[PDB]
Design goal:
Oligomer: monomer
Order of helices and strands: EEEEEEEE
Radius of gyration: 13 Å
Helix content: under 10%
Number of strands: 8
Strand content: 35-45%
């Protein structure tokens, strides 16, 4: 149920940008990073990565086609939620 949401910021390009949230489930919930960025989930220049009870979205080598405003829709065997933030990049 969204134990904790990630933060936000504005990086330059492949500088840092690190995100990490937490979510309960039954058992183990599911996450869906997405924000006009191809559901993030490591789809090109991103570096997402979920874990047992906590996920993490990392942005590296981000070109001029990722922008920040990134959210995370996390569901569960019998639940549904989401979060949102924004990690831009001054290419």
């Amino acid at each position: 149920r969204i134990l904790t949401k990630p933060r936000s910021m504005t990086v330059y390009e492949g500088e840092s940008a690190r995100f990490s949230c937490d979510t309960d489930g039954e058992p183990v919930p599911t996450v869906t990073w997405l924000r006009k960025g191809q559901v993030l989930s490591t789809s090109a220049r991103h570096q997402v990565t979920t874990t047992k009870y906590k996920s993490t979205f990392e942005i590296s080598s981000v070109q001029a086609s990722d922008e920040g405003n990134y959210s995370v829709v996390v569901e569960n065997s019998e639940g549904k939620q989401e979060a949102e933030f924004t990690l831009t990049i001054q290419k």
